[PDB]
Amino acid sequence: YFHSDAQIICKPHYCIYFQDKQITCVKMDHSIHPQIIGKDSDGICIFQKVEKQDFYLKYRNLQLCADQKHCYDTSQQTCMPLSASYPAVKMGGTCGNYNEPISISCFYEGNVCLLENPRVCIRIFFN
């Protein structure tokens, strides 16, 4: 079903019947990465928050938090659990990929804050 999902991704997505049936079958099969890629590609046409969140989560190859397989089906909105999971994933990502540059370059935090400060009023300067 991965090839069919990839083919449907090239054509019009999120508005069809055979594509919806293929997506339902893939979600039932519960693929590891092919399902995530299909969900990211199909949901790109209709809105971008869910598709981009799935693509970013699949960039790190996160097998856990499989709520996306059900949330992406008829994703007219976002559930509370899905929103909480996405927020937690983003916060973990920023924490990790901010601690990593500090380890690589100890002056990274000093640089960025000094890049946003110079062109401000005295209100931000006094801080």
Selected binder of other proteins within 49, 70, 73, 81 (CB under 8 A):
49
In the three-class reduction of DSSP (H, G, I as helix; E, B as strand; rest coil), residue 127 is classed as coil
The DSSP call for residue 2 is: H
User: Least distance in Å: CB of 52 to other proteins?
Assistant: 7
User: Least distance in Å: CB of 54 to other proteins?
Assistant: 12
The tokens describing 87, both together, are: 């927020």
Note whether 106 binds other proteins by CB under 8 A: yes
Closer residue to other proteins (CB): 30 or 97: 97
| Number of neighbours of residue 7 by Cβ within 10 angstroms | 11
User: Which residues lie below 8 Å from residue 63, measured CB to CB, with a gap of 6+?
Assistant: 32
Q: Whole-angstrom Cα distance, residue 100 to residue 87?
A: 20
Note whether 125 binds other proteins by CB under 8 A: yes
Residue ranges in contact with other proteins by CB under 8 A: 47-49, 52-53, 56, 59, 78, 82-83, 86-87, 90-91, 93-95, 97-98, 101-103, 106-107, 109-110, 112-120, 124-127
